[PDB]
Amino acid sequence: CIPKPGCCPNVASVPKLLVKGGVEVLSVVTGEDSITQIELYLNPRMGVNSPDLPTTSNWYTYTYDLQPKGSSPDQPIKENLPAYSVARVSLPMLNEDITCDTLQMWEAISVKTEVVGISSLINVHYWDMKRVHDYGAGIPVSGVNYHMFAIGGEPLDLQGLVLDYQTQYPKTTNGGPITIETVLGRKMTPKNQGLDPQAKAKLDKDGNYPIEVWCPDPSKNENSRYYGSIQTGSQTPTVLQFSNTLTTVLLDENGVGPLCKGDGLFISCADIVGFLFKTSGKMALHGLPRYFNVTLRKRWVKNPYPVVNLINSLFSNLMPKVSGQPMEGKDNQVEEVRIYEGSEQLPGDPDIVRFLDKFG
Amino acid sequence: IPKPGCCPNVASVPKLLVKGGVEVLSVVTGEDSITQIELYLNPRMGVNSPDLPTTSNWYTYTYDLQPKGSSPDQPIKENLPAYSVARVSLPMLNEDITCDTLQMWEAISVKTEVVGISSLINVHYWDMKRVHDYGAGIPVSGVNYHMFAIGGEPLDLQGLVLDYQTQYPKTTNGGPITIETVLGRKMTPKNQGLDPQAKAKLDKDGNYPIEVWCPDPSKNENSRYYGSIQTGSQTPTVLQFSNTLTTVLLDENGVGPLCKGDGLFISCADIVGFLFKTSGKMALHGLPRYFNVTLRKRWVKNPYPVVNLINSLFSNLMPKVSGQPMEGKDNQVEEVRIYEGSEQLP
Amino acid sequence: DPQAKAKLDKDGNYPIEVWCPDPSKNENSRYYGSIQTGSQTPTVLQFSNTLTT
Ligand SMILES: [Ca+2]
Ligand SMILES: [Ca+2]
Ligand SMILES: [Ca+2]
């Protein structure tokens, strides 16, 4: 009891939707050609990081009043240090094949993003705003802008750089932010005021890596895709775009996207929109959330790490350690290493040099 | 009886059938017809009508908005610019019940531009503030907020406010729709951030303030919205306009928005800048937008069963009944029997 | 106001600050425009004989 297919008018075809719902639907098993698409959001962390606090939640997505100390050295408080936002999405664990030494792994291909709440900025009638002139309206949110987001299978690697090492950031033992001297274990030097390879860290926590200290490391971030921009000025305007037709492709020059190591998706962002010119003349920054629409798929990859050697590390018996003289690092005690493979015709110099600069 | 060889070849352009006003929509067309609609949307800046002679002088403007200076804030409706919206009632179409398919409208492309850009060079408004002594008036400049949207269902909004302390006017019939109007409870500091619970659909015209509501990117799968902003005290207003520009509405899969309910929904809002008065006060200003939507007929498949579909209609046509109970609590039914087929007496 | 429309008849007699190209009716003509509104906002302009439209 079915109609003739030649009679039916042609109709286009589209990707078949199987499931739509909350995060619970990630535990659904799927075929190999399936495609998963996650929509989430991240509120900004501008020092005031929670509305549930009874006392000081009135300035959520804001910052306590910013102003220089006037006397060396600077001693800023946690609230005046905007920090990156970050979150992890626990993806479902996929299949693996031992006999081929291969395994599926989640790959991100495209993300759709836009800043939410842009239209809120036209509020020129906040009661404590600073009027541009007598009997006029206030000065809308404008000035400094720092926009940045990143997606990858690893936590975002990042580099440290400070405008002035003289600053004494709040101590970490209070559970607060993480500055450079927390990582290095020693006070910063003028080196840290420029680039310092010693100063590196991975984006572990939310609201604890101040933006004015840490910047994304372009070297190590190879399994992640980060985009950013800046705009610094007294009252420079806030220019922003938003639409749902813009899609950004995350694929690389090899045609592969970020690989979700550990069956986890790592997302991070931060958006500063400008100051809030209070009537008293004080200032305070403001931030807005971001909407993320990650498009994921399944890719087959070879297992790079030997299984047995891994578990061997976990046992003290099969991986004995010793607190001996240094054989790695700056003070290593290995004078030379030579690696031979195969055979060739006899060279005329056992002290082979490879650099023309070395002949002198 | 003409001679084909004698006559020169002429190009082939799409054939026009009918041209006119809204009454055109009632005509019947074929499967491959294409329809264009040209319309406009006046802005809504708190002053939302010219017909009332009491205060219509400040049409497309606000009432001299400025900060109070003392907590809390009690802004008035006429300082709350809101989105514009309208619905076009499209006609009914054909279907093929045998193949369980049918056709509904889709938007494929919209041509648009702002109207009245040229009127901004009026730097001689009699109460416009001079830039300096014996100078000329300060032109319309400052804050801008432009957006427009085309979709088959009304635009889905997201609520976010610069200050939850700001208490908005009570939602009197014909008033502004704010956060606490939706939730039924006073706002919390979360609303200064993102709150998934504070969502709403763009119901009415000129009642959804812009400084509160923003287009929800998740829920809006069936409409296309574009937007921009610049926030400056006196930053200039740059605007372009032409009729050669056209924006495609097709998605990744090559399908536009589908007009659910045989009607397309559109929304727009264009803040153009401040108006500086000699007294020093400041007020915003807007301009209309011209929309030229190109529509076609697309075949689609019915995903829902008919029996569940028809009862829904009956659910709406006949009113709910609050009668004596017949549910398991205190049922007033005492016995139920069911017979199926013949048999022998026990 | 759709009542207020008019064709561009004469020179020097149609104030810019009053009239704008009706988007709906100009279907047999191509028009391009811009604007820049400020007190002392600089004037940026470009010119060449290589570009065409
Ligand atoms: Ca590298
Ligand atoms: Ca969605
Ligand atoms: Ca026309």
Side-chain angles (χ1 to χ4, degrees), chain A residues 3 5-9 11-23 25-77 79-95 97-133 135-170 172-173 175-186 188-190 192-204 206-219 221-260 262-296:
Chain A
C7 295
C8 292
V11 65
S13 60
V14 297
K16 183 178 185 293
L17 178 61
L18 291 177
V19 178
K20 181 174 76 174
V23 66
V25 305
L26 295 175
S27 64
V28 175
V29 298
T30 61
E32 180 181 3
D33 292 331
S34 67
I35 295 170
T36 303
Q37 186 175 2
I38 298 169
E39 295 181 43
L40 58 89
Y41 68 97
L42 293 176
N43 287 319
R45 297 290 187 268
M46 297 295 168
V48 178
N49 297 321
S50 178
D52 292 331
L53 296 176
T55 62
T56 183
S57 295
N58 292 318
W59 296 99
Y60 186 74
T61 66
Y62 289 97
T63 300
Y64 287 169
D65 296 330
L66 287 81
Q67 62 184 356
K69 185 176 180 180
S71 66
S72 177
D74 190 359
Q75 292 179 356
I77 61 172
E79 291 81 3
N80 293 116
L81 274 70
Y84 292 104
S85 298
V86 65
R88 182 179 183 272
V89 176
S90 179
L91 294 176
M93 193 175 292
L94 295 175
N95 297 115
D97 192 359
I98 300 298
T99 188
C100 291
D101 198 1
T102 65
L103 58 90
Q104 288 181 354
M105 187 179 288
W106 290 101
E107 181 180 2
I109 59 171
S110 67
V111 62
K112 187 185 289 185
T113 183
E114 97 199 36
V115 177
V116 300
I118 298 170
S119 66
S120 66
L121 295 173
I122 65 169
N123 190 356
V124 186
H125 57 85
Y126 173 73
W127 60 271
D128 200 3
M129 287 175 68
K130 181 175 174 66
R131 292 181 179 179
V132 60
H133 63 277
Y135 293 167
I139 299 170
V141 176
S142 66
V144 174
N145 287 316
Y146 182 76
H147 297 285
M148 177 270 174
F149 68 94
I151 294 169
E154 294 180 353
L156 183 64
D157 297 330
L158 49 84
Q159 180 70 44
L161 189 150
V162 179
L163 190 149
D164 188 1
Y165 71 94
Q166 295 292 322
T167 62
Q168 292 179 356
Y169 294 102
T172 298
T173 187
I178 303 298
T179 182
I180 295 173
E181 67 183 1
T182 300
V183 175
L184 295 177
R186 67 183 184 271
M188 291 184 287
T189 61
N192 301 116
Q193 192 170 5
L195 193 149
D196 189 359
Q198 295 296 108
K200 291 182 183 292
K202 290 185 181 292
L203 185 59
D204 290 329
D206 184 359
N208 293 115
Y209 291 174
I211 298 169
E212 68 180 2
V213 176
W214 302 102
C215 66
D217 183 356
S219 42
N221 282 312
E222 330 228 63
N223 193 352
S224 296
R225 307 292 184 270
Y226 66 95
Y227 301 98
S229 68
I230 196 167
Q231 182 179 3
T232 67
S234 65
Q235 295 181 357
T236 60
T238 300
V239 176
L240 292 175
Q241 300 295 109
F242 65 97
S243 176
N244 62 2
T245 61
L246 294 174
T247 300
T248 300
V249 176
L250 295 177
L251 293 173
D252 63 356
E253 66 274 16
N254 290 319
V256 63
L259 296 174
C260 294
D263 292 331
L265 180 61
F266 290 100
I267 297 171
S268 65
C269 69
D271 285 334
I272 295 171
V273 177
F275 296 102
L276 189 149
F277 293 160
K278 294 180 181 179
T279 301
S280 67
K282 294 180 180 180
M283 291 180 179
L285 292 174
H286 178 67
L288 274 67
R290 295 184 70 90
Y291 158 74
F292 286 153
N293 189 358
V294 176
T295 301
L296 296 172

